[PDB]
Every structure is written in structure tokens, then in C-alpha cells.
Ligand binder design. Structure first.
Ligand SMILES: *[C@@H]1O[C@H](CO)[C@@H](O[C@@H]2O[C@H](CO)[C@@H](O)[C@H](O)[C@H]2NC(C)=O)[C@H](O)[C@H]1NC(C)=O
Lengths: 107, 47, 107
């Protein structure tokens, strides 16, 4: 989607403590949004373990079943490294895989 | 008093100092302009 | 995915936490979640079991920190009911502090 949070007011920069201001929220139709407003001095003390969208895609990429940036030793190695299985009626089929994780590089 | 200063009794102290607040839930059901719903939340600030 | 209102807390304060329950397509799913809160040496002190069905994949919950507590790093661990071996985790700290009034950047 595309959730954006911005100021509703266009003037009165640095408002007074306790002042009413308008929070403007643009986002996808039908979505439910959760909020929290934190002093930044908490984050100056401890900014670890903050969740973000980039870490979400990082967790998904760590859950990927493909292990190689393409190609392969043969047609079977192409599918097996990509994360696919193939089996034909003539007999040609992919290599057997019994491990969930990717093989580790020599490094 | 008559002097050029705010008297002490009507000085109103700031006291709402929590660090984290605005633990609210809202649903985007406003009219979608290009598929985007524009929600206006008028909210109190703290001290 | 677990969001906390702060990354670090005081003894005698409240921890607000929302758990977002999504499937593999990152879309909200309604399942039963088992959540546990563990001490610095790994002792579960509070545990929950709740389903997010008809709540749009959001579990807002709360818990109060006692003043009798061991300061250090505290861990929240969570897993679905139908997948107990896949454990998710995020951390926070408990300390005796007041917030500073300024930030220091070392560049
Ligand atoms: C008393 O409580 C403390 C925590 O306040 C615990 O001891 C800690 O053990 C961890 C290792 O798991 C160390 O990293 C800490 O430095 C220890 N804290 C200390 C020494 O203050 C434990 O539950 C009890 N320890 C003692 C010595 O009584």
C-alpha cells in the first residue's frame, strides 16, 4: 500500500504544549491503522529493535527457499536452485531436496 | 497585584508528562481520492 | 510482528504491545497465537493465548511491570498455535532512568 502521516496544519510551526493540531492520514481505502506517539529521548536512550518495513522484507528474504541468483549446472539444477520442482511423464525430474535451508557457501 | 508580572495563583503548571501516548486504532473509510482515503484527526498535544 | 510503545521501560510502568498476525502473503489472518514474556535468564513470567479472528489481524494487549524486578534485557516470544516450532521474538530493556533533554551524535 502507501500509508503517509503528515501535518494537517500548514502554519503555526512549533505549536504550544497542549495545543490542538490536526493529524492528516492518507492511506489505502479499507485499511486499519494503529498509532503510537513517543518522545525521541526514549530512542536516544535505546533505539534498538525498532520495527520498520525494510526489516519486514528482510525477514521475508531470509525465509526465501531459492538459494542462487539464477542459472544452474543443468535444467534440473536451474529449478532446484530457484526453488522449483519438476517431474515429467517421460522421466526427467528435479533433484531430491530434503533440507529446508539453503546450502552454505564456502566463504 | 499591581506589579508587571503574572501573579502566582493563576500560573498553571504543566503536568501531563508521559513519554508514550496516542495508543489509538482507526479505520480508513473516508472517500478514496485516487484510491487514497484522507483521514483528519484533530488531537490534543501534551505538555 | 510485535510492536511495543517503547524500547525501554521503568519498574512500576505499563507495557503496551500490539501483535500483527499475517500469513505468508503479509495479509491479515485469523489464528490463535501463543505469546510468552521471559526474564533475563529465561523464565516465563506472563503468557497469553488469543485468536485474532474478526479483529483484522491485530491483537492489542497490555501488562504491568512490578517494582520487584531484575533490571536488564527482557524478551517477548510468540508463535502460532498450529506452528509451535516457528518462534518469533523481540526484545526490550528495563532500567531506572529519567529522560535526557538533548541528543548526542557521534559522526
Ligand atoms: C539477583 O538478581 C540479579 C539481577 O538483578 C541476578 O544476577 C544477574 O545474573 C546475570 C546473569 O544471568 C548477570 O548478567 C548479572 O550481572 C547479575 N546481576 C547482578 C550480579 O547484580 C540474579 O537473579 C541474582 N543475583 C545475585 C548475585 O543475587
Amino acid at each position: 500500500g502507501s500509508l503517509v502521516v503528515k501535518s494537517g496544519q500548514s502554519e503555526d510551526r512549533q505549536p504550544v504544549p497542549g495545543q490542538q493540531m490536526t493529524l492528516k492520514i492518507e492511506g489505502d481505502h479499507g485499511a486499519r491503522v494503529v498509532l503510537v506517539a513517543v518522545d525521541k529521548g526514549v530512542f536516544v536512550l535505546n533505539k534498538k529493535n525498532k520495527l520498520t518495513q525494510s526489516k519486514i522484507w528482510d525477514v521475508v528474504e531470509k525465509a526465501d527457499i531459492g538459494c542462487t541468483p539464477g542459472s544452474g549446472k543443468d535444467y534440473a539444477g536451474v529449478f532446484s536452485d530457484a526453488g522449483l520442482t519438476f517431474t515429467s511423464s517421460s522421466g526427467q525430474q528435479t533433484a531430491q531436496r530434503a533440507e529446508l535451508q539453503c546450502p552454505q557457501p564456502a566463504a | 497585584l499591581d506589579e508587571d508580572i503574572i501573579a502566582e495563583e493563576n500560573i498553571v503548571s504543566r503536568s501531563e508528562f508521559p513519554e508514550s501516548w496516542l495508543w489509538n486504532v482507526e479505520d480508513l473509510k473516508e472517500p478514496p481520492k485516487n484510491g487514497i482515503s484522507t483521514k483528519l484527526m484533530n488531537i490534543f498535544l501534551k505538555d | 510482528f510485535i510492536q511495543t510503545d517503547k524500547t525501554i521501560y521503568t519498574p512500576g510502568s505499563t507495557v503496551l504491545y500490539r501483535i500483527f498476525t499475517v500469513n505468508h502473503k503479509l495479509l491479515p489472518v485469523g489464528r490463535t497465537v501463543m505469546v510468552n514474556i521471559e526474564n533475563p535468564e529465561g523464565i516465563p513470567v506472563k503468557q497469553d493465548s488469543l485468536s485474532s479472528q474478526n479483529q483484522l489481524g491485530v491483537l492489542p494487549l497490555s501488562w504491568d511491570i512490578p517494582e520487584l524486578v531484575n533490571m536488564g534485557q527482557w524478551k517477548i516470544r510468540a508463535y502460532y498455535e498450529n506452528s509451535p516450532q516457528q518462534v518469533f521474538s523481540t526484545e526490550f530493556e528495563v532500567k531506572e532512568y529519567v529522560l535526557p533533554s538533548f541528543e548526542v551524535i557521534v559522526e
